Each structure stands twice: as C-alpha cells, then as structure tokens.
Amino acid sequence: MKCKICNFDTCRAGELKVCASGEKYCFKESWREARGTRIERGCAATCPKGSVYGLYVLCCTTDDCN
C-alpha cells in the first residue's frame, strides 16, 4: 500500500511512500493564485475543499492512490 507523489504539469518530486495502512488515503489538491496554480500532495485522512480561491481536491486509495 504505497502512494506516488508528484507535481502535475511539473513532476519535480515523483517520490512514492507508504500511508494507506487502513483508515488513511492519499490527498492531491491544487491551489490557485493568478499567474500559475500549485498542485500539493500528501497522504492523510482529511480531504478539505475550497471555493474562495478555486483550488482542486482529489483523494485516492488502493494501488498508488493509497
């Protein structure tokens, strides 16, 4: 149960690790700004959203998405 972490549109990390051990999953989001968006990764159990800014949120589990 591992998860590959990388920045879309600029895969500069591409580092995979472990986290999905039971009640945990990977969370991938994208914060907006005005001259370029920033995709953030990390594995946990909280998948918050956005609106006042316009960030993207996407969680995953099982095979990589773990």
Contact 3, 16 (CB under 8 A): yes
Torsion region of 25: left, alpha or beta (phi above 0 gives left; psi -120 to 50 gives alpha)? beta
**Domain interval for residue 56:** 1-66
Taking phi over 0 as left and psi of -120 to 50 as alpha, with beta for the rest, 5 belongs to beta
Counted domains in the chain: 1
* Half-sphere exposure in the Cβ direction for 48 (13 Å, CA): 9
Q: Please name every residue paired with 60 in a beta bridge, in sequence order, or none if there are none.
A: 26
- For residue 63, what is the domain's CATH number? 2.10.60.10
Experimental approach was NMR
